[PDB]
Amino acid sequence: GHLGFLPRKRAASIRARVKAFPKDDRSKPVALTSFLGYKAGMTTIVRDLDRPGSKFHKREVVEAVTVVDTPPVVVVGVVGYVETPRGLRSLTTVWAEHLSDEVKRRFYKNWYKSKKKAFTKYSAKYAQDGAGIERELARIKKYASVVRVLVHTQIRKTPLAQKKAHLAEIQLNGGSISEKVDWAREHFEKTVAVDSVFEQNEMIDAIAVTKGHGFEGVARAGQRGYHSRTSINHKIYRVGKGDDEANGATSFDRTKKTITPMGGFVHYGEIKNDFIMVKGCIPGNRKRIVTLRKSLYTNTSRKALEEVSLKWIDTASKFGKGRFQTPAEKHAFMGTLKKDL
Amino acid sequence: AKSLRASSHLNAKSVKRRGVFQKAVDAREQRISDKLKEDLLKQKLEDLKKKE
């Protein structure tokens, strides 16, 4: 096999942490560098191909895309790291004073038995003109060469029966560390949307813990699957919206439909919020939390520069076989049934 | 065939990266940060919904 992907062992957690970040330019505006959601879905798209030099210039191509569900990420903190001869070293983290039920749930393994007394003295530590919070924020701005944002996911807006959101750390590639820590100050308790991180025609690297297959039998026997994998260069085809109906509508199809198939995806619900439709196949299975970083570097070929003109979204039944896009088209083709009249 | 780490191809790709190839990414970044700045104002309006 590949000797790089060793030791071929089970990961530390389902939420794999992002190993490296995109560099930094100290003149660029403040913007997030990685996003997270919940991968669950896969679907077929057709599009006309404006890729000149190819055998399919001004032709149409069918291809497989994946739908990661991405509820609006909520900022609950910021971390500052000093540059040492020993690597980086977190000197101060700061939180949001009033955090959701989801994250106070993340701080316990057994949620129901506890008195739910998580950040009581920390919120009481805030309870004045600030004084100590602004002291720690001065501490971050004075030192700390890089600044990373503590976020979490909106787990309840996702159909998952987990209730327990994931903490993460996302660096900022907007220059002047002052603007980093003050962007964070403008964003405590607030939420960050998907399309404020990504857009169409943008290459990303989705990282995921790879679908556990359990025990398996130099070509050696042992563990197969459940490894933390980084896959790079998956083009974003569509960023979606929850409130907006006709997400499944293209420039061509234009029928008022959601990208959610009939009876939803298999083993996972519908979509009730923002999503990213990424091309190809992201690692992990359905219901799996994926962390989407962006490219690391200027990765422009013509596979990264071209504009996607989506023509049609397959929303037919994945559970079973596909014959109808809408429920409306099933009973339009069928005629009327027994229990109808 | 020239390798992935073939010196001449890395230099030819650096000739690319100082032209159109970075400028499109540096326009896309401005459009992303713009909508991020737009995301503050909406939430501030929903601050003023409760403040009303």
Added chain:
Amino acid sequence: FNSSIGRTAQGKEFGVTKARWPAKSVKFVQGLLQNAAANAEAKGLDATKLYVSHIQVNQAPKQRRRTYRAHGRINKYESSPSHIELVVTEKEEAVAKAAEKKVVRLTSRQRGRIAAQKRIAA
């Protein structure tokens, strides 16, 4: 005596990965504990201040079953019986506040020094 036990979650309590549910042995021990508790009643002792201080199980003379067999061999099987014995004891809060005199010998230079110290210090 724990080689090739199926490791359990219920051993976390004791810091051991391997643990078992040995029904026959448990039933015998609690039969002896019930006997010991009643011996405590007959003697006239407390019920809640009562802890097991000594519990010792050592090997007994083995039983000798035999079964015929490969090549018609006589592979001798042996039961491994045991002599269980235990003592339950009254718990004692604050045992003693008394010690030995601990007589200290010290030379002319130490006698002299201590005397000089009490001439100076309070």
Added chain:
RNA sequence: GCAGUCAAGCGUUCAUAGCGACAUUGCUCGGCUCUUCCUAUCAUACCGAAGCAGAAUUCGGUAAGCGUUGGAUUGUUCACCCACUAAUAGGGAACGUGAGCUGGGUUUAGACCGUCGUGAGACAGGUUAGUUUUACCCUACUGAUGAAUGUUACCGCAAUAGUAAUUGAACUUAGUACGAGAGGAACAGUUCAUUCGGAUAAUUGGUUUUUGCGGCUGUCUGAUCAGGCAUUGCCGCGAAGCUACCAUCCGCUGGAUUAUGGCUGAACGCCUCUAAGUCAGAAUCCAUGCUAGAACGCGGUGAUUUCUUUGCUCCACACAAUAUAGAUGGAUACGAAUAAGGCGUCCUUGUGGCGUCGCUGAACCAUAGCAGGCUAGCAACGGUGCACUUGGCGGAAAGGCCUUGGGUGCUUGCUGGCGAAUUGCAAUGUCAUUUUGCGUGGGGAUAAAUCAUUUGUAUACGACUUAGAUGUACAACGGGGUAUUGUAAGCAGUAGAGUAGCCUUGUUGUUACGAUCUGCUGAGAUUAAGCCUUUGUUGUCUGAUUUGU
């Protein structure tokens, strides 16, 4: 190789005691499969020489990063055929790979002894030996738990170890460069594919004890329907799941160099790519990226049990204990250079002038008091201890550094007066600093984890992810969707072969039996067990343990 031709020298003087290098002249047991390594490299990368016009090629240099195919082959193959490919390079892992294995050879093959035998061999005489192989050993290698460092939880950092991409051609560039012509390139731009790896199941194909639905054969309930049943009786379709270059997606960019080409330039009054310097330059190296995280590497942050008969932490003095890889005046802070510097002063403010210093820390600062007591003063506004206190500074392990002041003892700067002894001529003579426990007298703070049940993104077992003390809670049912099968049971009919039966002998005459066709009927059944959704109904919400700076 032999003989001769030269022939640097040496032969004890030395060519005529002899040896004698490079040349030169005479004729002439084999093979299947994997892992790792070597370079003495076949291809891929970059170069140098070559009548190298272009293309193609030959030799040579650096180079082991990555590659090195598919069939027919058996008079002893110790041969080779015919293609594909960029190319199908050569070897090691001393009996590598026969205790990972087979395909064809000894003749009833070891050793000793005997009998009959001219030169010549037999005898199915006779005695014999042919033990390392299994280890429910040992440990490598893969993977998995795990006590400990207050507990417990979340977010992290990254020492170290591994690492990966590969080759082919297609379009412009072109029918241009170059070419009598025949032919015929290359960089920059873009497009695919091959091998390899990491994944993933949208669709396609595959697959079925959902044995889901349907059909057939048999077999039992006395017949329909239901099925009992058939070593899963047989057949068609087939969800979920699992899956295939039989499917689809994805697989990077900066420095340092090698051969080589150079710049300035010595050695050597020319020159010289090298000696001091110096630019470029390979698929090379090291990083970036990609994977694990040290369970005795580290950081930040959240919570830390309240009547346990005030449990737990923090300040003060107090007694016991427990130790110390080893206090016993002070770890006393510029940086850089060495063919140079430090300091002081001055000015034209500089790679500046002038003076001075080192040649050891042999220094410098602290240092005299019952192991440092008690007191009388004199001189000066100093030095220092202690605790209150104004800030500023310190992130590389900051955990300390300076500073503003008020009080407060002490001062050996100088001079007085008391006290020390008997520790008997020495005996470390104990004065340091950790880790604690029991007592005190004041502050402060009001938990989680495990088991058990559930979950299924996980799963040998562990472990992991979940869920649950009155809620857009959870469980069971229930409804709605989506799928799979293909028209359920029952009933009716004018559709009815063919027949029994009233005689009006029928030109859908009739009463009944009557395969099947038709209708209610894309119906019926199943549909989460690892699909979706939940205003319905019904119920659950509390058991044991363990943990302290």
Added chain:
RNA sequence: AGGGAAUCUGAACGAGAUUCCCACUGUCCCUAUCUA
């Protein structure tokens, strides 16, 4: 009421042997899934 055709061997043969022609198959390309 599994083939077929030749040949070597003791004209059909005999589950004799070999070679070829036609059909068939997971033996393989290249494995994948299910049950016991």
Added chain:
RNA sequence: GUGAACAGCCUCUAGUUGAUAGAAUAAUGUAGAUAAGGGAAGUCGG
């Protein structure tokens, strides 16, 4: 008894329910199936 049948499959009379159990259900192994396209290219040798 059904069946052309000593094939099985089902039973009457009569006799058994004896063989450690329970909990899980991943890979491997043995055995049996099915499979796109090609159809011995596998292998010394269908």
